[PDB]
């Protein structure tokens, strides 16, 4: 027991670890010195709490790495308790903690302001009349949404309506004639500039005599 291990820092800090970091990514290196000779000065590294199944420490190297995927939107930061135990009886311990905070990156989809949208209009509505407004909210809270009609929205309905790529306001583009169509189901995509499979909503437009 001549002395116990002392880490080089009380709290280690890794700030802005990318949440989309891959498995095995280097997080931070800890180090506890023990100036006893032989096995009394040889320390074994271990996490006691706080990693929540996302981090693993090398017992010998003291390197911490990730061990599955991270998520800013599920947990923004981690505080792990680490021990260093010397290699001979009586296995004296030393202690630190490790603070990891995550960098929010654009890896999530988008929510809309309702389940769907509806508009009831009359024939021969003037051009550029506002019909309804689609609005959506980047889950990631990084980007603004851009709005467009999806690929499968019909030529006929692309001729009659236009959505604003910024405001998401749908306006009258051409002349709505009842006999040509009294009801339209539009599909609006909200793009966040991100990866995800496209977030869409329905707009149901009804035309009256
Ligand atoms: Ca010792
Ligand atoms: Ca995320
Ligand atoms: Ca994110
Ligand atoms: Na998003």
Swiss-Prot record:
Domain Cadherin, first and last residues per copy: 9-112, 113-209
Tissue expression: In adult animals relatively high levels of expression are found in testis, skeletal muscle, heart, eye and thymus, and lower expression in kidney, lung and brain. Found in the sensory hair cells of the inner ear.
Compartments it resides in: Cell membrane
Residues annotated as glycosylated: 81, 114
Lineage top rank: taxon: Eukaryota
Involvement in disease: Defects in Cdh23 are the cause of waltzer (v) phenotype. Waltzer mice are characterized by deafness and vestibular dysfunction due to degeneration of the neuroepithelium within the inner ear.
Free-text note on domains in this protein's UniProt record: Three calcium ions are usually bound at the interface of each cadherin domain and rigidify the connections, imparting a strong curvature to the full-length ectodomain. Cadherin repeats 1 and 2 mediate calcium-dependent heterophilic interaction with PCDH15.
Biological role: Cadherins are calcium-dependent cell adhesion proteins. They preferentially interact with themselves in a homophilic manner in connecting cells. CDH23 is required for establishing and/or maintaining the proper organization of the stereocilia bundle of hair cells in the cochlea and the vestibule during late embryonic/early postnatal development. It is part of the functional network formed by USH1C, USH1G, CDH23 and MYO7A that mediates mechanotransduction in cochlear hair cells. Required for normal hearing.
Quaternary structure note: Interacts with USH1C and USH1G. antiparallel heterodimer with PCDH15. Isoform C1: Interacts with CAMSAP3; leading to inhibit CAMSAP3 ability to induce microtubule bundle formation.
The name this protein goes by in its record: Cadherin-23
Full-protein positions shown: 1202 to 1410 of 3354
